[PDB]
């Protein structure tokens, strides 16, 4: 059975530590959008989709240069 | 740090379970095919003594045979996921669900027939047990009606953590709709038939304890065996399903360990329930002297 | 040896077919940002990081409701 | 549709190659350890006849022994990736690169010593071959200097498609900096030593063809064998590295098939080059009568 990937969520992480952002959109797997952040440490976190932090992080990552 | 509290719950699966599952599914396929084919052969070879029970057993064996015929593709999907396409997902799910519902409802109808034949033997109600054809036709139609949602709302789902699946796609709120749809199998598949069977068999046993027939004891044992087999086969799966529903509804606290435990339990209980296609011929038909005598005659 | 994940890029895909967006930021793996779109069909595409299409897609996906 | 043109190139790896690689690395470890230890034992047990060649062989064996000692962790990393931490990545990479550079430069210096001893035997320049200690010390210092970048700019890299690696993190433009840093091993590790060896050994062979010594032929054969062994060990790896550099620089068109081919070739050529720690004792030392006689004496 398919299940959501993020049980609890975090809103605070330093952008400089982020390596990957994987976004799962609304679908059969889950009823809510969910963003997974994979860090340079090798760990994984579940960010808050609705927080202002995510948008700024994405904008920064797409404008490295 | 405290971020460890917020972390994805990695789904877990093992290849040993894969191999065991394939072996079990293949063995069940073979056994169910053999038993159902033998039952159909015995019943249809001779038109002498074509009674109501024969008709009920015929329909039941047909349903179990179709279920077994569909099993192998399900086993392959459990092995490597649904690579066979959307159309086969729809058709196979429809056939499987239809046959499952039909088998359950036919068991309930058999219980009703026995209740009418024993308790109301001397009354005028027992003349209403000659409607086997219409009853079975209605049961098949109702099973078809209850499995439309599977055909309409199923497709192939491709995820990242897990292999593809023959899941349901009802829209944005698919989870809750699936939860609601789960009510039908647990109401028309477990509760209603179980209550009917318990009522009918309990009154049957009450009548049989008051009689002086020598063969009462074996009938009591057979009825108890049937009820216990049905419970052992189906109760665990529905309990696990109810637990999953509660966990999704936050009545029970949600954690990764519980998720993995429930997934394993679902797999195991589905395997256990699938055994109803192999044991029905033994419990309902082959335990009767008439069927065994007919089989021995046919082997000539 | 680590290598970039996207050799050639595409700019046109219907948003309704997108299920996952994985963003790799600038790092040792590659010198350029790269966004991978996994579709409902089960296939994968490499979008253009600098196109206007990506931003609108991300905004839509995070505002399903 | 046409979208198939734009698709990620999935990296590919196989477990059979993993198992084969582990076996090869372990066998090489054992052989190199044995040979280097025997060489060191023979040289150090008796201080009689401590010549320049003995010193050069001592340093070379030390370098090869350290390389072999570092090998196993590299094999485990190739198996499951770098799980041992950043500090070990730095230290092991430093030690490995230092010993590789030292071995190459010591081979070149040995060639120079032979050239000075044969061609300039009767001249006054051959008195400059008694500076083995200072030359070897300078070689070790230069090797240490050339491997600082590895210690400074390496760490653990965690990716999604592939397991962790002991890679380099020089900043945003890490790829091009790594490409530039690759120039040092291909200049101070392949080209300069190869040219020096070819020059020295060619003039040595020219002198040896003009002489009337009975044992000239075996010397010719040994020199040719040394050159061919060095080429076979190192040329493929540098050619593959050059091809990878060109492919990254778009001189050669880039495709997934080429990527996979180059990765496999890199693995194979690294394995092939790693054999220099096992064959050096046979080629340079054990092929001499003095070493064999000393070993037989020591076994007493």
UniProtKB/Swiss-Prot annotation, chains A, C:
It comes from the Eukaryota. The gene is CXCL5. The chain holds residues 46 to 110 of 114 of the full protein. Disulfide bonds join 4-30, 6-46. This is ENA-78(9-78). Coiled coil: none annotated.
From Swiss-Prot, chains B, D:
Residues 46-54, 113-133, 202-221 are cytoplasmic. Phosphorylated upon ligand binding; which is required for desensitization. (Microbial infection) Proteolytically cleaved by Staphylococcus aureus staphopain A/SspP. This cleavage inhibits CXCR2-dependent neutrophil activation and chemotaxis. One of its GO terms (cellular component) is mitotic spindle. It is a multi-pass membrane protein. Keywords: Cell membrane, Chemotaxis, Disulfide bond, G-protein coupled receptor, Glycoprotein, Membrane, Phosphoprotein, Receptor, Transducer, Transmembrane, Transmembrane helix. It comes from the Eukaryota. The chain crosses the membrane at residues 19-45, 55-75, 91-112, 134-153, 179-201, 222-243, 265-285. Its main location: membrane. Signal peptide: none annotated. GO terms for molecular function: C-C chemokine binding; C-C chemokine receptor activity; C-X-C chemokine receptor activity; G protein-coupled receptor activity; interleukin-8 binding; interleukin-8 receptor activity. Coiled coil: none annotated. GO terms for biological process: calcium-mediated signaling; cell surface receptor signaling pathway; cellular defense response; chemotaxis; dendritic cell chemotaxis; immune response; inflammatory response; interleukin-8-mediated signaling pathway. It is found in: Cell membrane. The record marks 5-6 as: (Microbial infection) Cleavage. Disulfide bonds join 89-166. Receptor for interleukin-8 which is a powerful neutrophil chemotactic factor. Binding of IL-8 to the receptor causes activation of neutrophils. This response is mediated via a G-protein that activates a phosphatidylinositol-calcium second messenger system. Binds to IL-8 with high affinity. Also binds with high affinity to CXCL3, GRO/MGSA and NAP-2. It is linked to WHIM syndrome 2: An autosomal recessive form of WHIM syndrome, a primary immunodeficiency disorder characterized by warts, hypogammaglobulinemia, infections, and myelokathexis. Myelokathexis is a unique form of non-cyclic severe congenital neutropenia caused by accumulation of mature and degenerating neutrophils in the bone marrow. Monocytopenia and lymphopenia, especially B lymphopenia, also commonly occur. Interacts with IL8. Interacts with GNAI2. Belongs to the G-protein coupled receptor 1 family. This is C-X-C chemokine receptor type 2. It comes from Homo sapiens (Human).
């Amino acid at each position: 059975e398919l299940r959501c990937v993020c049980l609890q969520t975090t809103q605070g992480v330093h952008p400089k530590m982020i390596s990957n952002l994987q976004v799962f959109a609304i679908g059969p797997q889950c009823s809510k959008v969910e963003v997974v952040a994979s860090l340079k440490n090798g760990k994984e976190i579940c960010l808050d989709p609705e927080a202002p932090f995510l948008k700024k992080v994405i904008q920064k990552i797409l404008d490295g240069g | 740090p405290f971020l460890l509290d917020a972390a994805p719950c990695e789904p877990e699966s093992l290849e040993i379970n894969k191999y065991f599952v394939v072996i079990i599914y293949a063995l069940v396929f073979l056994l169910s095919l053999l038993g159902n084919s033998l039952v159909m052969l015995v019943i249809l070879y001779s038109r002498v003594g074509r009674s109501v029970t024969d008709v009920y057993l015929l329909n039941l064996a047909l349903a179990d045979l179709l279920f077994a015929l569909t099993l192998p593709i399900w086993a392959a999907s459990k092995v490597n996921g649904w690579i066979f396409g959307t159309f086969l997902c729809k058709v196979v799910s429809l056939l499987k669900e239809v046959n499952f519902y039909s088998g359950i409802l036919l068991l309930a109808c058999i219980s009703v027939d026995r209740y009418l034949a024993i308790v109301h033997a001397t009354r005028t109600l027992t003349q209403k047990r000659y409607l086997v054809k219409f009853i079975c036709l209605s049961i098949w139609g109702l099973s078809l009606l209850l499995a439309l949602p599977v055909l309409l709302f199923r497709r192939t789902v491709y995820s990242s953590n897990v292999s593809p699946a023959c899941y349901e796609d009802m829209g944005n709120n698919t989870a809750n709709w699936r939860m609601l749809l789960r009510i039908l199998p647990q109401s028309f598949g477990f509760i209603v038939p179980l209550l009917i069977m318990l009522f009918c068999y309990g009154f049957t046993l009450r009548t049989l304890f008051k009689a002086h027939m020598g063969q009462k004891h074996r009938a009591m044992r057979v009825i108890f065996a049937v009820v216990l087999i049905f419970l052992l086969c189906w109760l665990p799966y529905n309990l696990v399903l109810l637990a999953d529903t509660l966990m999704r509804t936050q009545v029970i606290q949600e954690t990764c360990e519980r998720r993995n435990h429930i997934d394993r339990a679902l797999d195991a209980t589905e395997i256990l329930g699938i055994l109803h296609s192999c044991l029905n011929p033994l419990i309902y038909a082959f335990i009767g002297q008439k069927f065994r005598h007919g089989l021995l005659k046919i082997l000539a």
